Amino acid sequence: MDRWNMHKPMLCDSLPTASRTAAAILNLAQREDVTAEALAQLIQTDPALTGRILRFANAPATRRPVASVIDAIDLVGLPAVRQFALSLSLREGRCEAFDYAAYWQKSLARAVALQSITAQASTVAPKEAFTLGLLADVGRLALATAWPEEYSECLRKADGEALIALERERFATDHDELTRMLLTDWGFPQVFIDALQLSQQDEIRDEGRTGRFARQLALAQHIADHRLAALSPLLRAEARRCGLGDEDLARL
Ligand SMILES: [Cl-]
Ligand SMILES: [Cl-]
Structure with a gap:
């Protein structure tokens, strides 16, 4: 999980993804031959994974920032983005009253x-x-x-x-x-x-x-x-x- 820094609160890796959406992302990510496009379309239905990817792609060295999964893929490569997608293998969620x-x-x-x-x-x-x-x-x-x-x-x-x-x-x-x-x-x-x-x-x-x-x-x-x-x-x-x-x- 992510530490909560009081001065500069910041969660990203720990944000959950929906079970059904994760299952489908993992399925596609493990598919032998998936397009950049199909993977992006699917990943960008999930706020958590989308954030992580943008953050990775925009991290200080890179060059210009991106603001879509498909642009992140073009920038850092499909293999790197795929790694983030496969990482869901490793939630949704603990806050009882949150819908x-x-x-x-x-x-x-x-x-x-x-x-x-x-x-x-x-x-x-x-x-x-x-x-x-x-x-x-x-x-x-x-x-x-x-x-x-x-x-x-x-x-x-x-x-x-x-x-x-x-x-x-x-x-x-x-x-x-x-x-x-x-x-x-x-x-x-x-x-x-x-x-x-x-x-x-x-x-x-x-x-x-x-x-x-x-x-x-x-x-x-x-x-x-x-x-x-x-x-x-x-x-x-x-x-x-x-x-x-x-x-x-x-x-x-
Ligand atoms: Cl911290
Ligand atoms: Cl608490």
């Missing part, structure tokens, strides 16, 4: 939504956006993994802003700050973290690419929450402001 299935389901759905949204726009590369969507709240997984019993207490007594406040008290960090710190450790440049933080405001007025990407993130989040539960006038207005064709996003 892991819900977390994994929502993370993928959001990744998929953000990819579609950005695919019809010109802000960021959709494969990189997918990854950010996948990882947008990986800080939740990390707290649940690091402090399973303490975090179960928090989860039973609070949600929303009150949960954030409770996390700060117990851990001197919260799941959103932790996410940004993780994403920063794993190689993402600050504009992406800022766009993510922006996307979490009640209302996103900000101009520029950062504002537009933030509105795209906010839309992926709210749309994903909606299916897995229409959009408010504000969100529709923000949707219109990025420019949106609809409405295969509100279902499938």
